[PDB]
């Protein structure tokens, strides 16, 4: 009694309205300028 | 070498004919590997077969 499961389910169905739908969210937690750069990427070169 | 978070491995291979000594002569070392690691290094050890 008054002892509920901590995990509760979503009502993900396509018939629900906007705001009740499954949303895939990704969070980027990249970090700055404290170690040698490991990914850089953006270089471009023109013709000779 | 280790400078500012970078490991530098510089090397050379040579064919040789000697008994138990190191020879006399000149040989440069070409740069081979740089690594951007970023850690403190104090001791080491090699490994044997």
From Swiss-Prot, chain B:
Glycans are attached at residue 40. Attaches the virion to the cell membrane by interacting with host receptor, initiating the infection. The major receptor is host ACE2. When S2/S2' has been cleaved, binding to the receptor triggers direct fusion at the cell membrane. When S2/S2' has not been cleaved, binding to the receptor results in internalization of the virus by endocytosis using host TFRC and GRM2 and leading to fusion of the virion membrane with the host endosomal membrane. Alternatively, may use NRP1/NRP2 and integrin as entry receptors. It comes from the Viruses. Binds to host ACE2. RBD also interacts with the N-linked glycan on 'Asn-90' of ACE2. Cleavage of S generates a polybasic C-terminal sequence on S1 that binds to host Neuropilin-1 (NRP1) and Neuropilin-2 (NRP2) receptors. Interacts with host integrin alpha-5/beta-1 (ITGA5:ITGB1) and with ACE2 in complex with integrin alpha-5/beta-1 (ITGA5:ITGB1). May interact via cytoplasmic c-terminus with M protein. May interact (via N-terminus) with host bilirubin and biliverdin, thereby preventing antibody binding to the SARS-CoV-2 spike NTD via an allosteric mechanism. This is Spike protein S1. The gene is S. The lineage of its organism: Viruses, Riboviria, Orthornavirae, Pisuviricota, Pisoniviricetes. The chain holds residues 195 to 243 of 1273 of the full protein.
